[PDB]
Amino acid sequence: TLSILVAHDLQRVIGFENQLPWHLPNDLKHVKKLSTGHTLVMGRKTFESIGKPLPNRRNVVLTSDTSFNVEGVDVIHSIEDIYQLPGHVFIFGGQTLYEEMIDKVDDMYITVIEGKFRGDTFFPPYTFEDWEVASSVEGKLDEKNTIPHTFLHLIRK
Ligand SMILES: NC(=O)C1=CN([C@H]2O[C@H](COP(=O)(O)OP(=O)(O)OC[C@H]3O[C@@H](n4cnc5c(N)ncnc54)[C@H](OP(=O)(O)O)[C@@H]3O)[C@@H](O)[C@H]2O)C=CC1
Ligand SMILES: COc1cc(C(C)(C)C#Cc2c(C)nc(N)nc2N)cc(OC)c1OC
Numbered sequence: 001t002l003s004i005l006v007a008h009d010l011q012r013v014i015g016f017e018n019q020l021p022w023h024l025p026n027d028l029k030h031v032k033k034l035s036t037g038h039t040l041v042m043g044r045k046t047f048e049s050i051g052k053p054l055p056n057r058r059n060v061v062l063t064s065d066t067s068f069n070v071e072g073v074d075v076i077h078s079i080e081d082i083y084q085l086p087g088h089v090f091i092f093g094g095q096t097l098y099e100e101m102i103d104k105v106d107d108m109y110i111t112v113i114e115g116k117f118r119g120d121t122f123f124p125p126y127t128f129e130d131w132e133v134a135s136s137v138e139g140k141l142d143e144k145n146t147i148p149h150t151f152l153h154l155i156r157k
Pocket of ligand 1 (some may be wrong): 014015016017018020021042043044045046047049062063064065077078079092093094095096097098100121
């Protein structure tokens with residue numbers, strides 16, 4: 001299964017200056033729950049924004065860099081390589097990889113952040129005309145989670 005896993009705001013912002021623009025522990029838990037024991041695929045820039053692989057799952061980085069080597073990370077050098085990865089594979093970022101993959105994936109796990117943040121990195125436009133809403137669940141507003149947010153699971157029609 002090939003899925004997108006992303007959090008974006010009302011204008012599809014996903015990042016600003018190598019950071020997540022918002023602080024949402026609930027969404028980090030969501031990522032942990034979905035991707036633990038599976039595979040994350042990310043572009044080089046996305047990986048370097050975290051600096052280390054996430055524990056208890058396969059971490060795959062796409063780069064043209066033939067020297068690229070990080071403990072706990074498996075490297076791939078083309079998009080075609082993604083289709084040979086076994087199991088449930090989640091496309092994890094960033095803008096470039098999402099642009100390359102959005103027309104290819106089976107489904108998308110999207111956290112909609114109900115705010116408007118300053119951004120420099122964007123999720124590509126998409127229409128609900130092409131995507132069925134399998135589930136839509138409101139996140140809990142909290143002491144530690146102060147931005148309204150919704151977990152969507154969208155399946156390609
Ligand atoms: N929410 C998120 O996903 C976040 C993402 N980001 C980031 O994304 C921002 C914008 O950069 P963006 O380009 O979208 O980042 P990406 O994570 O998509 O990384 C792009 C890089 O991935 C590699 N790559 C992509 N496609 C291919 C391909 N077909 N073949 C070989 N290599 C490929 C290249 O690495 P190389 O140049 O090494 O060859 C390319 O420069 C960055 O500023 C970074 O911080 C920032 C914050 C949050
Ligand atoms: C998992 O934590 C981070 C993830 C990320 C990335 C960009 C790899 C991501 C993501 C992501 C999140 C947070 N939520 C959802 N739903 N999908 C994603 N791809 C960047 C970070 O800092 C810049 C993170 O904090 C260390």
